């Protein structure tokens, strides 16, 4: 996030960190939508032009985090992936059209003060809030600057 601010504790309990096993590094952000489903961008898991085609075993999802690098003992929860589902029409060849993917957790994650799912909008919700001028919020552990 560029030109943003430090999030408050528990401010985004649905924020998920897609963690690469080896080498151990941040892969992408993601979101918790139920006790066993995580939503993310398709290009985080699949992008043939770079030969990226992650399988369930290549990563982990860390939930309930605040600090980027530390293992937040007694707070964060680390889950393994049971299955990955990429939108069949995700367009990695051109413009990343339908850049979306779902990940099912092997075991349900227990909710807490730091772990809680976000809601998905229904038609009326989308229609009324998705208007120019209206503000949303974005969160993440990415670059603080472009370069």
């Amino acid at each position: 996030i560029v030109e943003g601010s430090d999030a408050e504790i528990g401010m985004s309990p649905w924020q998920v960190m897609l963690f690469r096993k080896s080498p151990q590094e941040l892969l992408c952000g993601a979101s918790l939508i139920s006790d066993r489903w995580v939503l993310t961008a398709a290009h985080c898991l699949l992008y043939p032009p770079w030969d990226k085609n992650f399988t369930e075993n290549d990563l982990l999802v860390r939930i309930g985090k605040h600090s980027r690098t530390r293992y937040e003992r007694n707070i964060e929860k680390i889950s393994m992936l049971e299955k990955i589902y990429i939108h069949p029409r995700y367009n990695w060849r051109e413009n990343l059209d339908r850049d979306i993917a779902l990940m099912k957790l092997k075991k349900p994650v227990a909710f807490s003060d730091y772990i809680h799912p976000v809601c998905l909008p229904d038609r009326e919700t989308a229609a009324s809030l998705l208007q120019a001028g209206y503000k949303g919020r974005v969160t993440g552990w990415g670059n603080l600057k472009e370069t």
């Binding site: 096993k21 151990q24 590094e25 941040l26 982990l60 690098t69 293992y71 680390i78 393994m80």
Partner: peptide, 10 residues
């Protein structure tokens, strides 16, 4: 610079 995570998580 990521702190090692428990071995239980593979």
């Amino acid at each position: 610079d990521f702190e090692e995570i428990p071995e239980e998580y593979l």
